[PDB]
């Protein structure tokens, strides 16, 4: 039999091409490998994590190297407002001379790509000023990548493999990760800001060669050890400070100004220094909570066992959950993806409205790409969070050990949960779509005053509570007599209120009826996607149509045409259907973010306010209007620098449409077609001398759903990425 | 049973009859679990005893002309010095928190380890009013009824001040001046549509 795959004898004995495809697709499902034990499972995962870490630091090293080698960082730092950053050089032998000239720009030697990832603003903010600064960082991270790779090898060796119990010491790992991984890293990052980043923003060079002889503050550590910590907040950078120079600069290293630096339109460095110092203290303290070898602290099992409501409303409460969580990796992975997935959305939300990197706001293409980038990644992570929660129920859930606790009771009323999610999705869809169609008919008939425009009073009321005085609610921070206004009036409100009432920045943009409709469409996306994913998990173990679904696994094709038909009945298929709704939801979010910002960046916000209340406005004034430059990247008269995005735009449409083939036409058609191809090859003279070793067959039922979904997603992403960058960059960049 | 909160109703089974101050009032059945009721029984007495001290203290300050209960801690803000009965006190806010935190931790920690004692007696009853242990039923009923009354009164102090801004004694004087024109129905706050 064939060697590959070495981890499954069932695959290795398959004489068809399914062996190749399935061998690739089951490589990282360690639990399903032949001869796998629990202890070997954890040691492989530990080794794999070292590999991922080494790739991350190597990928970062490659970015640093190419910007220094081929970028214009040293030129960009001089005039960041009027210089486009360079990502890397182009050496494409297929280029013609017009293409070579078209992509030559920014004073570069030859063709180059413009960066959109914002690394220039990030690196410039944290104190990098020269190409040699980037070169040393690149070599340092390449070395760090090597060390992690060695550690991955080291801990696979006979005397360094941790035992199974080592991976299940929950109290000790939480203490270290909270205090050391989070707390000390944040404390160390405060050291960089106080010692390097802040001085570099004030025109003083601090490097490894002189940082031991430079005083971060004129009073060196006397305020710190004497408790007079307020001395570090005196004489902050003035409003006239020019970033990177000593004119208008101050001396404070810890402040709470609370606003935006007037020139860079980004958060103050002294606030970001005090921010990281504050959480570092909290995280170091929080890391002394759990039991270890020293006789103090909590044991997490005791905490869970205690929290049972005395009235029996939650049944057994949280009894038995410690083993349920501590023994299942899919439960832990589901909690990790759900938490990280939400934080990825939070990063996108807060970075566009509280830009932390100098000159990030004015780079419109970078801001658009960064928000879209992280929202699409958050969407994928959330779908994975529910997928592994569904896998937990099939593989790791033990009904006997979870008898009567909160987890078991979720399955008890799963129909109630699914029924109510179904109602909310239907309600939002009916009325959200209905109002849009009503407004479209009114616009078509020429009566824009007959449409249903509902003021977002609840959201506009929140903005009033934060100090936005436009709506006249005179509430909390919007009223100058409230205690909330008075108490903070000496710490951060003067800066915060100044920024929130500036209508040229993205801090709490003004909202109207156009924002009301879009937000309710977003809710429909979240609820429907949750409905599909939640049903896939709660029904994973069985249903009326298939009472014993657990016996078949997480992913199987179907149960056949009997009992009416069971296509797409597994929990794997519920995730597969939910990915479509995730893309649809994130699409609505990113269209909404992009259109509301393009109108702001052009100064004509009225277009969004007027055209966003009906769906023809989106198609006409957003998709059609902003495609004009994209599709002219190359035309019968020539081409320009946008021809790559024009080409990638159609490239996306093609991959997307190809995915329809794997989703619409199913296996039986193709297997019978391949059988005539097998006949044709064998009877053809001069070709039947050559022969195959793996019998050709059609893709499997499950494989084609993944292959179709992969093409659908890739085409989805590449089409909008090309349009997002091209429309934003051509308009302003 | 000390009475019936809702005449004609049926007393809850889970409320023992001899429990002091038992009027059968438990619309939400919060005391259904015996263990929970035991904790609630202690908390009511402790809450009432603190409320009785607080209401007595709040009224005493304003009756003697030393301000209202709400203005008392303003010296620690503006920069003035503390005063008690007009006698100047030599401590400042940060110092006061030190004595209170240590003092209250000792007393409350000592009470906490007693495991739910609510009628200690002994050194806490020097005059021997409850030494009998048989006639204490009325005294326990009197304590809880005055305790519940004090708890309602203090909520009145907080609620009334948040609406009109005047002290409890000043509010009483204003009600008597114009009972029909000065009450909760005339705040402009309590009833939005009046």
């Amino acid at each position: 039999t064939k060697l590959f795959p070495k981890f499954s004898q069932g695959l290795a004995q398959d004489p068809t091409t399914r062996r190749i495809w399935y061998g690739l697709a089951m490589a990282h499902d360690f639990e399903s490998h032949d001869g796998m034990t629990e202890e070997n499972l954890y040691q492989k995962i530990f080794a794999s994590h070292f590999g991922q870490l080494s790739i991350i630091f190597l990928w970062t090293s490659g970015n640093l190297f190419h910007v220094a080698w081929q970028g214009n960082f040293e030129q960009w730092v001089t005039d960041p407002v009027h210089i486009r950053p360079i990502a890397h050089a182009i050496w494409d032998p297929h280029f013609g001379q017009p293409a070579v000239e078209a992509f030559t720009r920014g004073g570069a030697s030859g063709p180059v790509n413009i960066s959109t990832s914002g690394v220039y603003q990030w690196w410039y903010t944290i104190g990098m000023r020269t190409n040699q600064d980037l070169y040393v960082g690149s070599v340092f991270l390449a070395l760090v990548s090597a060390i992690f790779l060695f550690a991955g090898w080291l801990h696979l060796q006979p005397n360094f493999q941790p035992s199974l119990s080592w991976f299940k010491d929950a109290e000790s790992r939480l203490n270290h990760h909270l205090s050391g991984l989070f707390g000390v890293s944040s404390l160390a990052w405060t050291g960089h800001l106080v010692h390097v980043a802040i001085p570099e923003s004030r025109g003083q060079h601090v490097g490894w060669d002189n940082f031991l002889s430079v005083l971060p503050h004129p009073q060196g550590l006397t305020p710190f050890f004497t408790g007079n910590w307020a001395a570090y907040a005196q004489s902050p950078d003035t409003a006239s400070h020019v970033f990177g120079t000593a004119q208008g600069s101050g001396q404070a290293i810890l402040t709470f100004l609370g606003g935006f630096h007037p020139q860079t339109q980004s958060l103050w460095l002294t606030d970001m220094a005090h921010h990281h110092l504050a959480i570092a203290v909290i995280f170091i303290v929080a890391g002394h909570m759990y039991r270890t070898n020293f006789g103090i602290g909590h044991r997490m099992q005791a905490i869970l066992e205690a929290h049972t409501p005395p009235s029996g409303s939650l049944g057994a409460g949280h009894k038995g959950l410690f083993d349920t969580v501590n023994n299942s990796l899919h439960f832990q992975l589901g909690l990790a993806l759900a938490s990280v997935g939400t934080i990825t959305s939070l990063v996108a939300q807060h970075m566009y409205s509280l830009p932390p990197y100098a000159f990030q706001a004015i780079d419109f293409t970078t801001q658009a790409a960064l928000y879209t980038h992280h929202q699409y990644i958050a969407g994928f992570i959330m779908c994975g969070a529910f997928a592994h929660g569904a896998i937990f129920f099939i593989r790791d859930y033990d009904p006997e050990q979870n008898k009567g606790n909160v987890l078991a009771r979720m399955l008890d009323h799963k129909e109630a949960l699914i029924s109510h999610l179904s109602w909310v999705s239907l309600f939002l869809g009916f009325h959200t779509l209905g109002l849009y169609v009503h407004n479209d008919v009114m616009q078509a008939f020429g009566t824009p005053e007959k449409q249903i425009l509902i003021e977002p009073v609840f959201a506009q009321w929140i903005q009033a509570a934060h100090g936005k005085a436009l709506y006249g609610f005179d509430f909390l921070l919007s009223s100058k007599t409230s205690a909330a206004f008075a108490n903070g009036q000496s710490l951060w409100l003067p800066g915060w209120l100044d920024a929130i009432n500036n209508n040229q920045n993205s801090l709490f943009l003004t909202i109207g009826p156009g924002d009301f409709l879009v937000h309710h469409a977003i809710a429909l996306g979240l609820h429907t996607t949750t409905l599909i994913l939640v049903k896939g998990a709660l029904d994973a173990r069985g249903s009326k149509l298939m009472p014993d679904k657990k016996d078949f696994g997480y992913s199987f094709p179907c149960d056949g045409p009997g009992r009416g038909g069971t296509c797409d009945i597994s929990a794997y298929d519920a995730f597969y259907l939910a990915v479509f709704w995730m893309l649809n939801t994130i699409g609505w979010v990113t269209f909404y973010w992009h259109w509301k910002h393009l109108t702001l960046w052009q100064g004509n916000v009225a277009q969004f306010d007027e055209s966003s209340t009906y769906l023809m406005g989106w198609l006409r004034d957003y998709l059609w209007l902003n495609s004009s430059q994209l599709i002219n990247g190359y035309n019968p008269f020539g081409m320009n620098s946008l021809s790559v995005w024009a080409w990638t735009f159609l490239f996306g449409h093609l991959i997307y449409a190809t995915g329809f083939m794997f989703l619409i036409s199913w296996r039986g058609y193709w297997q019978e077609l391949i059988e005539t191809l097998v006949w044709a090859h064998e009877k053809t003279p001069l070709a039947n001398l050559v022969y195959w070793k793996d019998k050709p067959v059609a893709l499997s039922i499950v494989q084609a759903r993944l292959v179709g979904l992969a093409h659908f997603s890739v085409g989805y992403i590449f089409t909008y990425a090309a349009f997002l960058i091209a429309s934003t960059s051509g308009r302003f960049g | 049973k000390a009475g019936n909160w809702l005449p004609g109703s049926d007393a809850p089974a889970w409320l023992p009859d001899d429990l002091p101050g038992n009027y059968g009032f438990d619309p939400l059945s919060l005391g259904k679990e015996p263990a929970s009721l035991k904790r609630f029984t202690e908390s009511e007495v402790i809450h009432g005893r603190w409320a009785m001290l607080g209401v007595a203290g709040s009224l005493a300050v304003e009756l003697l002309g030393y301000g209202n209960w709400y203005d008392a801690p303003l010296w620690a803000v503006n920069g003035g010095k503390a005063t008690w009965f007009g006698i100047e006190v030599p401590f400042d806010l940060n110092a006061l928190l030190a004595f209170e935190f240590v003092a209250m931790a000792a007393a409350e920690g000592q009470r906490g380890d007693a495991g739910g004692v609510v009628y200690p007696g002994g050194a806490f009853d020097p005059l021997g009013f409850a030494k009998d242990s048989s006639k204490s039923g009325e005294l326990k009923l009197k304590e809880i009824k005055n305790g519940r009354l004090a708890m309602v009164a203090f909520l009145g102090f907080v609620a009334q001040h948040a609406a009109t801004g005047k002290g409890p004694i000043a509010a009483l004087g204003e009600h008597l001046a114009n009972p029909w024109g000065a009450n909760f129905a005339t705040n402009g706050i309590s009833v939005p549509f009046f």
Binding site: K2, L3, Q132 | -
Partner: protein, 37 residues
């Protein structure tokens, strides 16, 4: 010291785009087809 030569793309782009893929595909094709002893 770090700056690579100006001719680096001329060698590395064909090397990583045409040469290494050819050897990688040949290595993988032989590996998957290889039969167990």
């Amino acid at each position: 010291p770090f700056v690579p030569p100006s001719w680096a793309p001329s060698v590395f782009v064909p090397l990583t785009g045409l040469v290494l893929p050819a050897i990688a595909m040949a290595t993988l094709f032989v590996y998957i087809e290889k039969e167990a002893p």
